């Protein structure tokens, strides 16, 4: 899609107040806890036995940061996310066989987590373009799913 310059600054500005070392882990940990069937994709992660065990897991934390790193280049490249996300889509499709419904579940959880952090400065209009961006991301993830 066409990105307006005001769309794009809004996004860089929101992502700008975002710290991956803190958001990353919050969102991946919240996902494995609220939609527990996603735990099965991550075999080597450790003690995911309790929420507390999920919440304080360092392999979980590491991956949460890896995940926010990929989103970082989307923000940086809003015009080539499809280009940019082709083998990511291929590993998830063909290597890990991730049901693509889970990309959607992750995007919604990152949003609740950012919401919780920004409070009332996370407005309907910011939400509205954060959403546009989140579904452009989600689409790029399910692009090599055939």
């Amino acid at each position: 899609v066409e990105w307006t310059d005001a769309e794009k600054s809004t996004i860089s500005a929101v992502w700008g107040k975002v710290n991956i070392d803190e958001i990353g882990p919050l969102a991946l940990a919240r996902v494995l806890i609220v939609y527990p069937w996603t735990q099965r994709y991550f075999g080597s992660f450790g003690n995911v036995s309790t929420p507390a065990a999920i919440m304080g897991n360092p392999k979980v934390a590491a991956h949460g940061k890896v995940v926010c790193g990929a989103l970082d280049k989307a923000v940086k490249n809003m015009g080539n996310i499809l280009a940019t996300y082709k083998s990511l889509s291929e590993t998830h499709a063909n290597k890990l066989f991730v049901d693509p419904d889970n990309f959607r579940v992750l995007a919604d959880v990152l949003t609740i987590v950012i919401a919780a952090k920004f409070g009332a400065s996370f407005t309907p209009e910011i939400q509205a373009t954060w959403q546009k961006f989140m579904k452009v991301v989600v689409a790029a993830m399910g692009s090599r799913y055939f």
Binding site: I33, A116, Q127
Partner: protein
């Protein structure tokens, strides 16, 4: 399928949010129409569809008072919300995929307003309840 654990967490949390309910409903509705514009066709007879409008405010409290009541009807929700199922099924005929949209926005507003209380464990139980309220409401469609 709400456990005994689930209803207790629901009721407890509900006790915390009760006081702000008209604000949370109002805000969640305004977010749905603004972030998810395909919901707007159902509310075309309304003057202002923008966040904070009058009818937007008034209706958002109507929704939270319905959910507040489902909190007391947690042992049988499909039975408890039968009349509301009909209305949305045949009077308004709402595409039932919009129930997930509203539900996501209520979760987005709870986090905005109760970030400390809206713990991962509170999330599992409110999600489950909200899904169960959506499934009772879509019961009379076919």
């Amino acid at each position: 399928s709400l456990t005994a654990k689930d209803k207790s967490v629901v009721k407890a949390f509900w006790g915390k949010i009760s006081g702000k309910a008209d604000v949370v409903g109002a805000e969640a509705l305004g977010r749905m129409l603004t972030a998810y514009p395909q919901t707007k066709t159902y509310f075309s007879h309304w003057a202002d569809l923008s966040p904070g409008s009058g009818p937007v405010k008034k209706h958002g409290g109507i929704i939270m008072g319905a959910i507040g009541k489902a909190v007391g009807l947690m042992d049988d929700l499909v039975g408890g919300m039968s009349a509301l199922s009909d209305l949305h099924a045949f009077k308004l005929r709402v595409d039932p995929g919009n129930f997930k949209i509203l539900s996501h926005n209520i979760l987005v507003t709870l986090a905005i307003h109760f970030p400390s209380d809206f713990t991962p464990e509170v999330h599992i139980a409110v999600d489950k309840f909200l899904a169960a309220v959506s499934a009772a409401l879509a019961d009379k469609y076919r």
